[PDB]
PDB file of C-alpha atoms in Angstrom:
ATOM      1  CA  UNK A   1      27.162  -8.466 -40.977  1.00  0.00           C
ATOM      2  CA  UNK A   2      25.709 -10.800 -38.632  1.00  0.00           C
ATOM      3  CA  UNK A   3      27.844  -9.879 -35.469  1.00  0.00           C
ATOM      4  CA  UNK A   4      26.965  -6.133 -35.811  1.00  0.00           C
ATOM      5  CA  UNK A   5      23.642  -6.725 -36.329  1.00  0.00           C
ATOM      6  CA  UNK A   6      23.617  -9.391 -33.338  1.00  0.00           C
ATOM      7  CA  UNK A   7      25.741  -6.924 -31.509  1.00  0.00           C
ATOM      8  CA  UNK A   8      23.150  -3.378 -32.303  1.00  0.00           C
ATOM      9  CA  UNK A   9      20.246  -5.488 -31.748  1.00  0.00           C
ATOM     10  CA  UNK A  10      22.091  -6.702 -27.729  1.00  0.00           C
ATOM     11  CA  UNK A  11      22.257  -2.976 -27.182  1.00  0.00           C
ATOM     12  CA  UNK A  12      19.120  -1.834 -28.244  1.00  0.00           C
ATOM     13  CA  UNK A  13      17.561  -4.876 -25.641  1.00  0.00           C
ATOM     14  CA  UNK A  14      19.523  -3.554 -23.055  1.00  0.00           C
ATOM     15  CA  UNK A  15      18.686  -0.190 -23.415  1.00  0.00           C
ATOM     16  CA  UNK A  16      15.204  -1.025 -23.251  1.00  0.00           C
ATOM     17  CA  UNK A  17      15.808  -3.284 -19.872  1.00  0.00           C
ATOM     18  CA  UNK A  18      17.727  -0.154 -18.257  1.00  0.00           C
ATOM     19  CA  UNK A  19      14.945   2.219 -19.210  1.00  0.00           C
ATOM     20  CA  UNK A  20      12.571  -0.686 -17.423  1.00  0.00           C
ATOM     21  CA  UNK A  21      14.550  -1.326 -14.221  1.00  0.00           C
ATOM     22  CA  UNK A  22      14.692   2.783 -13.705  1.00  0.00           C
ATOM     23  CA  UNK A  23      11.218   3.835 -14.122  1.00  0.00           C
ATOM     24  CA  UNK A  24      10.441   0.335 -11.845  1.00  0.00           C
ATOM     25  CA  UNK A  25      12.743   1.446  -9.024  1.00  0.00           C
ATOM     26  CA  UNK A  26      11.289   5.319  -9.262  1.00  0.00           C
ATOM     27  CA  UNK A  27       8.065   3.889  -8.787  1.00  0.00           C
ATOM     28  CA  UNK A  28       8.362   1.551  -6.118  1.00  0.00           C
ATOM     29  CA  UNK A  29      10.679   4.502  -4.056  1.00  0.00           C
ATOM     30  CA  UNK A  30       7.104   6.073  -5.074  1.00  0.00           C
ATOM     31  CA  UNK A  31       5.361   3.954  -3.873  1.00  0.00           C
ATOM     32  CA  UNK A  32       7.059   4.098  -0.635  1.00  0.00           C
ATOM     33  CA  UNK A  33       6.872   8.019   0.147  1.00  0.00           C
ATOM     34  CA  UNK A  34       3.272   7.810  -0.888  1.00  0.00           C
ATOM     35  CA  UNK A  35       2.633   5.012   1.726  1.00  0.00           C
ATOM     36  CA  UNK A  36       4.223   6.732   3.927  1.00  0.00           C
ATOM     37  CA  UNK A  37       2.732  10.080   3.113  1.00  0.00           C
ATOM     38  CA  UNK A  38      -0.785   8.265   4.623  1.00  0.00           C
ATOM     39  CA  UNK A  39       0.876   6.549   7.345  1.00  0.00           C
ATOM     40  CA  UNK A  40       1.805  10.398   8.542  1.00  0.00           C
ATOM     41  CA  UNK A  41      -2.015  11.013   8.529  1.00  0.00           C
ATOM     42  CA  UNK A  42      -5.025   8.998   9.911  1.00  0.00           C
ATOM     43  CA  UNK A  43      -4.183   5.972   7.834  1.00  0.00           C
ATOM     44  CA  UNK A  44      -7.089   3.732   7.034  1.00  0.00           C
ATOM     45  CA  UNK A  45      -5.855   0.339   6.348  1.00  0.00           C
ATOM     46  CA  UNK A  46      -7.678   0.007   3.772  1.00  0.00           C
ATOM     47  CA  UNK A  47      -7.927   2.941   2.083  1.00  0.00           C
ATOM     48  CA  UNK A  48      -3.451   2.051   2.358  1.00  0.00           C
ATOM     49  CA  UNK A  49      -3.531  -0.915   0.796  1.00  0.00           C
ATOM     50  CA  UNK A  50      -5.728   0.192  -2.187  1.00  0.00           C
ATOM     51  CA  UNK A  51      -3.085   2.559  -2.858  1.00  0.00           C
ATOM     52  CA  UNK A  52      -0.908  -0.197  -2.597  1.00  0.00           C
ATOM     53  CA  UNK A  53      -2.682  -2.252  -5.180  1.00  0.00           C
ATOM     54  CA  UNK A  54      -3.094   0.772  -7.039  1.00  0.00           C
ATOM     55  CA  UNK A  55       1.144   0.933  -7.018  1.00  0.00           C
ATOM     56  CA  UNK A  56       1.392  -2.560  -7.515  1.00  0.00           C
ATOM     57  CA  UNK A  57      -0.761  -2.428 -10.669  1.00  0.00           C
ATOM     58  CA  UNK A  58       1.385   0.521 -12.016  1.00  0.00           C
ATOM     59  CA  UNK A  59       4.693  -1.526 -11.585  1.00  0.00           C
ATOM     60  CA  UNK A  60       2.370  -4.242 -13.642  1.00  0.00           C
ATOM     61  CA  UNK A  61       2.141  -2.423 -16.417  1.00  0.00           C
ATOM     62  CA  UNK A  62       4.883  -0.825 -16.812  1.00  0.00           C
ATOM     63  CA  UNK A  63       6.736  -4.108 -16.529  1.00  0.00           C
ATOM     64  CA  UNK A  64       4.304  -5.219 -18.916  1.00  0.00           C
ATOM     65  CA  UNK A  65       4.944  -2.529 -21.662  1.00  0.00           C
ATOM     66  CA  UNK A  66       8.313  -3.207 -21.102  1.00  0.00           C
ATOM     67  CA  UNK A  67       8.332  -6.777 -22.286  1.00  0.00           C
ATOM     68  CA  UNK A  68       5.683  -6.188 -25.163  1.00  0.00           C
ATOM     69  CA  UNK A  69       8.994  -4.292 -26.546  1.00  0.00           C
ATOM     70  CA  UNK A  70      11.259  -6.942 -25.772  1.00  0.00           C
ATOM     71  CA  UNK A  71       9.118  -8.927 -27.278  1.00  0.00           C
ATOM     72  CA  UNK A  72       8.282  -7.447 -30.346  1.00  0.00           C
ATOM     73  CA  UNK A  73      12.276  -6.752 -30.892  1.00  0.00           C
ATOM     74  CA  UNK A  74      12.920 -10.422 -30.060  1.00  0.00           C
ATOM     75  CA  UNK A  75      10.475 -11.387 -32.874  1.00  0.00           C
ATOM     76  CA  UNK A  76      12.183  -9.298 -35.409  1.00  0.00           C
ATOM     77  CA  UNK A  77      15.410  -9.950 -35.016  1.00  0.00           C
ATOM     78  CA  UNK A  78      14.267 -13.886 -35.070  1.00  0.00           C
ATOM     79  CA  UNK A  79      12.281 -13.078 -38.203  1.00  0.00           C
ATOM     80  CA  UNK A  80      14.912 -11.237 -39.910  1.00  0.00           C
ATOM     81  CA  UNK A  81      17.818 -14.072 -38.774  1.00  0.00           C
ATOM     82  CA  UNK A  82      15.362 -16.899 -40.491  1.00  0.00           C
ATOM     83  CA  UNK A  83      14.250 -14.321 -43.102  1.00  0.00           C
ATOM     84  CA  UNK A  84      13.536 -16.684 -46.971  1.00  0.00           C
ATOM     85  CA  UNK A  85      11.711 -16.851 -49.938  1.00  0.00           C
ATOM     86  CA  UNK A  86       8.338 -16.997 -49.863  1.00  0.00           C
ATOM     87  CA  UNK A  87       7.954 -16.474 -46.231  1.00  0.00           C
ATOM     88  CA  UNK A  88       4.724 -14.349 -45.472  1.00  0.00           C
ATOM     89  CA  UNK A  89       4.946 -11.047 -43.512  1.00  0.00           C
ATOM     90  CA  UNK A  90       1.194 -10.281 -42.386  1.00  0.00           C
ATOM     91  CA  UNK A  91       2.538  -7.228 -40.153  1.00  0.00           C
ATOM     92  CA  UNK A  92       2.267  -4.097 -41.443  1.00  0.00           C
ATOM     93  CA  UNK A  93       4.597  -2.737 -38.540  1.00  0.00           C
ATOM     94  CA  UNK A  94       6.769  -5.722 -38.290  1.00  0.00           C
ATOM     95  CA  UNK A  95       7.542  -5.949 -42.013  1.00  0.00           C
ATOM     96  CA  UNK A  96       7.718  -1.642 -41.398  1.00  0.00           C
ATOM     97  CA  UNK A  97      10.443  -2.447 -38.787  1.00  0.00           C
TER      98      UNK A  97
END
């Protein structure tokens, strides 16, 4: 069962990158308006680009929660593919999953 399992686990990665690449692009088109938004006003440079780091830190983690799933999917499927005898699962959750 190797190749379906292979093949589900391909899927599920991918599913996770598409859900990643769509809430990065909503935020940067965010990002954007918002800018924008205090360009239409007095717009003090600063005060801009804090809300730009402020954006850019946002995109940060999100990207980051996005590969601490990718991650933790890549180690199980590695786990489970190596998987033997009197191998020691410490992980409640990954031995869970």
């Amino acid at each position: 069962e190797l190749s379906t399992l292979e093949a589900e686990m391909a899927v599920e990665r991918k599913a996770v990158e598409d859900q990643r690449d769509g809430e990065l692009e909503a935020r940067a088109q965010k990002l954007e308006a918002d800018l924008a938004e205090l360009e239409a006003e007095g717009a003090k440079a600063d005060a801009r680009r804090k809300v730009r780091d402020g954006g850019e830190r946002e995109m940060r983690q999100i990207r980051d929660r996005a590969q601490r799933e990718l991650d933790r999917l890549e180690d199980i499927w590695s786990t489970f593919t190596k998987l033997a005898p009197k191998q020691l699962i410490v992980d409640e959750n990954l031995y869970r999953e």
